[PDB]
Short mmCIF file of C-alpha atoms and ligand atoms in Angstrom, two decimals:
data_model
loop_
_atom_site.label_atom_id
_atom_site.label_comp_id
_atom_site.label_asym_id
_atom_site.label_seq_id
_atom_site.Cartn_x
_atom_site.Cartn_y
_atom_site.Cartn_z
CA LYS A 1 -48.89 99.93 84.80
CA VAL A 2 -48.92 100.92 88.49
CA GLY A 3 -50.03 97.62 90.03
CA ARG A 4 -50.63 97.54 93.80
CA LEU A 5 -50.08 100.74 95.79
CA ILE A 6 -50.25 101.53 99.50
CA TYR A 7 -53.28 103.77 100.11
CA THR A 8 -53.56 106.09 103.13
CA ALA A 9 -56.87 107.74 104.04
CA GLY A 10 -57.61 110.39 106.66
CA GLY A 11 -55.42 110.98 109.67
CA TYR A 12 -54.81 113.68 112.23
CA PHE A 13 -52.46 116.65 112.45
CA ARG A 14 -53.89 119.75 114.20
CA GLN A 15 -57.27 118.41 112.97
CA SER A 16 -58.93 115.51 111.19
CA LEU A 17 -57.73 115.21 107.59
CA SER A 18 -59.31 114.30 104.26
CA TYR A 19 -56.07 113.37 102.49
CA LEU A 20 -56.08 110.24 100.34
CA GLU A 21 -52.61 109.46 99.02
CA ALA A 22 -51.02 106.40 97.47
CA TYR A 23 -47.44 105.18 97.55
CA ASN A 24 -45.65 103.14 94.87
CA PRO A 25 -42.84 101.06 96.44
CA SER A 26 -41.70 100.22 92.92
CA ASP A 27 -41.47 104.03 92.46
CA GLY A 28 -40.75 105.86 95.62
CA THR A 29 -43.50 108.13 94.27
CA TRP A 30 -46.66 109.42 95.91
CA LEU A 31 -50.03 110.08 94.29
CA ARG A 32 -52.67 112.53 95.45
CA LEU A 33 -56.16 111.10 95.04
CA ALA A 34 -59.69 112.30 95.71
CA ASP A 35 -60.20 113.85 99.14
CA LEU A 36 -62.55 112.20 101.61
CA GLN A 37 -65.99 113.80 101.64
CA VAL A 38 -65.64 114.23 105.43
CA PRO A 39 -62.23 114.42 107.14
CA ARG A 40 -61.71 111.58 109.60
CA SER A 41 -59.05 110.09 111.85
CA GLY A 42 -58.94 106.95 113.94
CA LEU A 43 -60.56 105.03 111.09
CA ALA A 44 -59.49 101.75 109.51
CA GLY A 45 -58.80 100.76 105.92
CA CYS A 46 -59.35 97.56 103.99
CA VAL A 47 -59.75 96.33 100.42
CA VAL A 48 -62.49 94.17 98.94
CA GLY A 49 -62.86 93.53 95.23
CA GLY A 50 -60.33 96.24 94.40
CA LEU A 51 -62.39 98.89 96.17
CA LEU A 52 -60.85 100.65 99.14
CA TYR A 53 -63.11 101.12 102.18
CA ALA A 54 -62.79 103.66 104.98
CA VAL A 55 -64.60 102.54 108.14
CA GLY A 56 -65.37 104.51 111.27
CA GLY A 57 -63.18 107.18 112.80
CA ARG A 58 -63.96 110.60 114.22
CA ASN A 59 -64.46 114.04 112.64
CA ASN A 60 -63.38 117.08 114.68
CA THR A 61 -68.08 113.58 115.68
CA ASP A 62 -67.55 109.81 116.16
CA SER A 63 -68.33 108.20 112.80
CA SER A 64 -70.42 105.18 111.86
CA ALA A 65 -69.57 105.92 108.24
CA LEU A 66 -68.52 103.41 105.62
CA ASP A 67 -67.20 104.90 102.40
CA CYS A 68 -65.97 103.20 99.26
CA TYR A 69 -63.21 104.45 96.98
CA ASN A 70 -62.87 103.20 93.42
CA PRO A 71 -59.31 103.51 92.09
CA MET A 72 -60.58 103.33 88.51
CA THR A 73 -63.03 106.20 88.99
CA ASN A 74 -61.00 108.08 91.64
CA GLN A 75 -64.34 108.67 93.35
CA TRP A 76 -65.71 108.15 96.87
CA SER A 77 -69.16 106.62 97.41
CA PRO A 78 -71.12 106.32 100.69
CA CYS A 79 -72.17 102.91 101.98
CA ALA A 80 -74.63 101.64 104.55
CA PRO A 81 -73.37 102.95 107.92
CA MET A 82 -72.64 100.73 110.87
CA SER A 83 -75.20 100.22 113.62
CA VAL A 84 -73.02 102.35 115.96
CA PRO A 85 -70.24 104.91 115.71
CA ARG A 86 -66.80 103.31 116.11
CA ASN A 87 -63.84 105.56 116.83
CA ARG A 88 -60.47 103.80 117.02
CA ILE A 89 -62.02 100.87 115.18
CA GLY A 90 -60.21 97.74 114.06
CA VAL A 91 -61.12 96.01 110.80
CA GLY A 92 -60.54 92.68 109.08
CA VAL A 93 -61.76 90.96 105.94
CA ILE A 94 -62.98 87.37 105.73
CA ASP A 95 -64.28 86.06 102.40
CA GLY A 96 -65.00 89.52 101.03
CA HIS A 97 -66.80 90.63 104.21
CA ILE A 98 -65.58 93.49 106.42
CA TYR A 99 -65.61 92.90 110.18
CA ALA A 100 -65.78 96.06 112.29
CA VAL A 101 -64.33 95.35 115.74
CA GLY A 102 -64.77 97.42 118.86
CA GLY A 103 -64.05 101.12 118.92
CA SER A 104 -65.64 103.89 120.94
CA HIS A 105 -68.68 106.15 120.68
CA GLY A 106 -67.94 108.92 123.10
CA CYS A 107 -67.50 107.09 126.38
CA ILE A 108 -69.07 103.76 125.37
CA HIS A 109 -66.30 101.26 124.71
CA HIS A 110 -67.64 98.67 122.29
CA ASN A 111 -67.08 94.98 122.64
CA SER A 112 -69.59 94.45 119.82
CA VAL A 113 -68.71 93.46 116.27
CA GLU A 114 -70.59 93.79 112.99
CA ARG A 115 -70.04 92.31 109.55
CA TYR A 116 -70.63 94.11 106.25
CA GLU A 117 -71.60 92.32 103.04
CA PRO A 118 -70.71 94.37 99.93
CA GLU A 119 -72.97 92.18 97.80
CA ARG A 120 -75.95 93.48 99.82
CA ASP A 121 -74.72 96.78 101.35
CA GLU A 122 -75.85 95.52 104.75
CA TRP A 123 -74.40 95.30 108.26
CA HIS A 124 -75.13 92.58 110.79
CA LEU A 125 -73.96 92.14 114.37
CA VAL A 126 -71.99 88.99 115.06
CA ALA A 127 -70.98 87.62 118.46
CA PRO A 128 -69.43 90.30 120.72
CA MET A 129 -65.87 90.06 121.99
CA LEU A 130 -65.14 88.92 125.53
CA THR A 131 -63.45 92.32 126.06
CA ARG A 132 -64.33 95.88 125.13
CA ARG A 133 -61.48 97.18 122.96
CA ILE A 134 -60.84 100.53 121.37
CA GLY A 135 -57.59 101.13 119.51
CA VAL A 136 -57.52 97.37 118.90
CA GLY A 137 -55.34 95.75 116.25
CA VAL A 138 -57.18 93.30 113.98
CA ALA A 139 -55.71 90.53 111.78
CA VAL A 140 -57.19 87.64 109.78
CA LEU A 141 -55.33 84.34 109.66
CA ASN A 142 -56.57 80.92 108.54
CA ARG A 143 -60.06 82.41 108.21
CA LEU A 144 -59.92 83.37 111.91
CA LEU A 145 -60.26 87.00 113.02
CA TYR A 146 -57.85 88.13 115.76
CA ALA A 147 -58.45 91.10 118.07
CA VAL A 148 -55.20 92.19 119.75
CA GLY A 149 -54.58 94.71 122.59
CA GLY A 150 -56.40 98.03 122.84
CA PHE A 151 -58.13 99.82 125.71
CA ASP A 152 -61.27 98.54 127.48
CA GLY A 153 -62.18 101.87 129.14
CA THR A 154 -60.36 101.02 132.39
CA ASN A 155 -57.18 99.15 131.42
CA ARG A 156 -54.78 99.20 128.55
CA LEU A 157 -54.61 95.60 127.40
CA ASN A 158 -52.09 92.96 126.46
CA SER A 159 -54.69 90.23 125.97
CA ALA A 160 -55.86 88.92 122.61
CA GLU A 161 -58.88 86.96 121.47
CA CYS A 162 -59.84 84.96 118.43
CA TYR A 163 -63.20 84.93 116.67
CA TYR A 164 -64.43 81.80 114.91
CA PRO A 165 -66.78 82.63 112.01
CA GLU A 166 -68.07 79.09 111.48
CA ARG A 167 -69.05 78.77 115.17
CA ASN A 168 -69.70 82.51 115.75
CA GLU A 169 -67.70 82.62 118.98
CA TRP A 170 -64.66 84.24 120.60
CA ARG A 171 -61.86 82.57 122.59
CA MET A 172 -59.05 84.35 124.41
CA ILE A 173 -55.54 83.47 123.27
CA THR A 174 -52.08 83.88 124.73
CA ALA A 175 -51.47 87.42 125.93
CA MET A 176 -48.70 89.55 124.48
CA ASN A 177 -45.44 90.41 126.21
CA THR A 178 -46.46 94.08 126.29
CA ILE A 179 -49.55 96.18 126.79
CA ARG A 180 -50.38 97.78 123.43
CA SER A 181 -53.14 100.14 122.40
CA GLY A 182 -53.01 101.90 119.05
CA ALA A 183 -50.71 99.20 117.72
CA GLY A 184 -50.28 98.12 114.15
CA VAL A 185 -51.41 94.53 113.68
CA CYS A 186 -50.98 92.60 110.46
CA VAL A 187 -50.17 89.17 109.11
CA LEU A 188 -46.91 88.39 107.32
CA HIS A 189 -46.08 84.79 106.35
CA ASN A 190 -48.57 82.91 108.55
CA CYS A 191 -47.68 85.03 111.63
CA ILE A 192 -49.46 87.90 113.39
CA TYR A 193 -47.30 90.98 113.90
CA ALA A 194 -47.93 93.70 116.49
CA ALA A 195 -45.74 96.77 115.99
CA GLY A 196 -45.52 99.73 118.33
CA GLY A 197 -48.54 100.85 120.31
CA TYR A 198 -48.89 102.63 123.64
CA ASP A 199 -48.34 100.73 126.90
CA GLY A 200 -49.94 103.32 129.22
CA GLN A 201 -46.84 105.41 129.85
CA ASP A 202 -44.83 105.37 126.59
CA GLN A 203 -45.19 104.91 122.86
CA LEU A 204 -43.47 101.65 121.98
CA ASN A 205 -41.07 100.78 119.18
CA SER A 206 -41.00 97.09 120.15
CA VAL A 207 -42.46 94.42 117.90
CA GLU A 208 -43.69 90.95 118.76
CA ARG A 209 -45.07 88.36 116.37
CA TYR A 210 -47.37 85.54 117.40
CA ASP A 211 -46.79 81.99 116.21
CA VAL A 212 -50.20 80.35 116.37
CA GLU A 213 -49.03 76.75 116.60
CA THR A 214 -46.57 77.44 119.43
CA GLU A 215 -49.07 79.87 121.03
CA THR A 216 -46.26 82.24 122.03
CA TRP A 217 -45.40 85.89 121.35
CA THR A 218 -41.72 86.47 120.58
CA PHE A 219 -40.13 89.90 120.11
CA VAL A 220 -38.44 90.80 116.82
CA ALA A 221 -36.29 93.63 115.53
CA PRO A 222 -37.81 96.90 116.81
CA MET A 223 -38.72 99.91 114.71
CA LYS A 224 -36.54 103.00 114.62
CA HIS A 225 -39.35 105.38 115.67
CA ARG A 226 -41.59 104.86 118.68
CA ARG A 227 -45.11 105.30 117.43
CA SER A 228 -48.77 104.67 118.21
CA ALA A 229 -51.87 105.25 116.10
CA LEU A 230 -49.80 104.07 113.15
CA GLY A 231 -50.92 102.73 109.82
CA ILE A 232 -49.71 99.26 108.90
CA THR A 233 -49.95 97.02 105.85
CA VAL A 234 -48.19 94.19 104.01
CA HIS A 235 -46.85 94.62 100.48
CA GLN A 236 -44.77 91.87 98.80
CA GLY A 237 -43.65 90.10 101.95
CA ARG A 238 -42.72 93.29 103.82
CA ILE A 239 -44.46 95.27 106.55
CA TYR A 240 -44.97 99.01 106.16
CA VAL A 241 -45.78 101.39 109.01
CA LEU A 242 -46.88 104.93 108.24
CA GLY A 243 -46.90 107.97 110.47
CA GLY A 244 -48.31 107.82 113.97
CA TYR A 245 -47.65 109.65 117.23
CA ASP A 246 -44.40 109.19 119.17
CA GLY A 247 -45.38 111.14 122.29
CA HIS A 248 -44.34 114.58 121.04
CA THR A 249 -44.66 114.96 117.26
CA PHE A 250 -46.72 113.49 114.40
CA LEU A 251 -44.47 111.28 112.30
CA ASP A 252 -44.26 111.25 108.53
CA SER A 253 -41.74 108.40 108.54
CA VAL A 254 -42.53 105.14 106.72
CA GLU A 255 -40.44 102.18 107.92
CA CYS A 256 -40.29 98.83 106.12
CA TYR A 257 -39.63 95.58 107.98
CA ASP A 258 -37.83 92.78 106.15
CA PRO A 259 -38.59 89.38 107.71
CA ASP A 260 -35.76 87.61 105.85
CA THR A 261 -33.27 90.06 107.44
CA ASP A 262 -35.24 91.12 110.57
CA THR A 263 -34.47 94.78 109.91
CA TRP A 264 -36.44 98.03 109.78
CA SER A 265 -35.49 100.43 106.98
CA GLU A 266 -36.81 103.93 106.43
CA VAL A 267 -38.10 103.84 102.86
CA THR A 268 -39.86 107.21 102.44
CA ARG A 269 -41.71 110.05 104.13
CA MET A 270 -45.34 110.98 103.72
CA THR A 271 -46.03 114.39 102.20
CA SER A 272 -46.81 115.48 105.77
CA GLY A 273 -46.77 113.90 109.20
CA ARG A 274 -50.04 112.46 110.50
CA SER A 275 -51.48 109.76 112.73
CA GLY A 276 -54.71 107.79 112.87
CA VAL A 277 -54.75 106.94 109.16
CA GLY A 278 -56.41 104.02 107.43
CA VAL A 279 -54.08 101.97 105.23
CA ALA A 280 -54.75 99.33 102.59
CA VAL A 281 -53.06 97.76 99.57
CA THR A 282 -54.47 97.22 96.08
C1 GED B 1 -57.52 116.83 124.73
C2 GED B 1 -56.29 117.43 125.42
N1 GED B 1 -55.06 117.01 124.75
C3 GED B 1 -54.01 116.65 125.46
C4 GED B 1 -52.86 116.25 124.81
N2 GED B 1 -52.81 116.23 123.49
C5 GED B 1 -51.57 115.80 122.85
C6 GED B 1 -51.44 116.26 121.39
C7 GED B 1 -52.23 115.37 120.40
O1 GED B 1 -52.94 115.90 119.62
N3 GED B 1 -52.09 113.91 120.45
C8 GED B 1 -52.82 113.02 119.53
C9 GED B 1 -52.31 111.76 119.23
C10 GED B 1 -53.00 110.91 118.37
C11 GED B 1 -54.20 111.33 117.80
S1 GED B 1 -55.13 110.23 116.68
O2 GED B 1 -55.60 110.89 115.45
O3 GED B 1 -54.33 109.12 116.15
N4 GED B 1 -56.44 109.70 117.67
C12 GED B 1 -57.69 110.44 117.57
C13 GED B 1 -58.92 109.58 117.59
N5 GED B 1 -59.58 109.26 116.34
O4 GED B 1 -59.34 109.20 118.62
C14 GED B 1 -56.12 108.62 118.60
C15 GED B 1 -55.77 108.97 119.90
C16 GED B 1 -55.41 107.99 120.82
C17 GED B 1 -55.38 106.65 120.43
N6 GED B 1 -54.99 105.64 121.40
C18 GED B 1 -56.02 104.89 122.12
C19 GED B 1 -56.36 105.56 123.46
N7 GED B 1 -57.28 104.91 124.39
O5 GED B 1 -55.88 106.60 123.75
S2 GED B 1 -53.32 105.34 121.67
O6 GED B 1 -53.13 104.10 122.43
O7 GED B 1 -52.61 105.04 120.43
C20 GED B 1 -52.50 106.74 122.50
C21 GED B 1 -52.53 106.84 123.88
C22 GED B 1 -51.90 107.90 124.51
C23 GED B 1 -51.24 108.86 123.76
O8 GED B 1 -50.60 109.93 124.39
C24 GED B 1 -51.47 110.91 124.86
C25 GED B 1 -51.20 108.75 122.37
C26 GED B 1 -51.83 107.69 121.74
C27 GED B 1 -55.71 106.29 119.09
C28 GED B 1 -55.67 104.92 118.70
C29 GED B 1 -55.99 104.56 117.40
C30 GED B 1 -56.35 105.54 116.48
C31 GED B 1 -56.39 106.88 116.86
C32 GED B 1 -56.06 107.25 118.19
C33 GED B 1 -54.71 112.58 118.11
C34 GED B 1 -54.02 113.42 118.97
C35 GED B 1 -53.86 116.59 122.77
C36 GED B 1 -55.02 117.00 123.43
#
């Protein structure tokens, strides 16, 4: 069997893409899957019940689209769209529900947040963030959604806030050491990781993880390639970053961070360089 792959949807390189490819870290092999009905970039990926969802993005135009991919049918299926278009959206999953955080619709910078129930194919607004954030990293940890960095329309941000589903409220948390938009955010071993991003003048290769109990952000081993608008995911206790923009070119490099050795390896290259891809694991 081919159990658990890293899926990449959409992206940008000279134009919005429709590519859907999968990577087998047991293999080193790539798989070409069904193209997206509409090419998109700046979207987010997540998994719920073994289906892969592609949320938001822009087609070259800002998308409110939610689309479902079934790995067993290799087929894409449209879902109820969001209430608003959300370019540079962040996404997280709590109890089988997809939270769409922030993003832009043209020049509107959203601080709003909606929740999608796959059981009912319905979207509902939840409490809005304290800060408008596009290009925001999103991570779920102890059933709490975290919104990290991004751009509020005026300032690139280093702040972070925390949404509480049971109370339906947001609370700021400790700010990061660096301003980061278009960063990869994920959760590896009870910690939130924030890799790369763009600090307003440079693409970053730095990496800080947040310890919730100590409330502090500490830097860790940096990546080899500066990159923003990167895909990120966690597979078997390791972080994977995919593609992105380094300020000049569109990367195809996929680096793998080992927490037990605090080291970034290059483990493969995408079939072509791209940025703004959605990434998930199933
Ligand atoms: C128009 C005139 N020019 C001038 C220069 N050009 C340079 C050549 C070029 O094409 N770069 C390029 C790079 C990337 C894409 S993208 O697909 O990933 N993408 C598209 C999307 N869906 O919006 C996105 C763009 C910007 C983002 N950022 C958040 C933010 N507020 O900018 S960011 O922090 O990471 C950033 C900031 C400054 C940077 O340096 C300028 C580069 C990154 C995105 C964040 C998340 C997801 C997609 C993003 C697309 C194009 C091109 C065109």
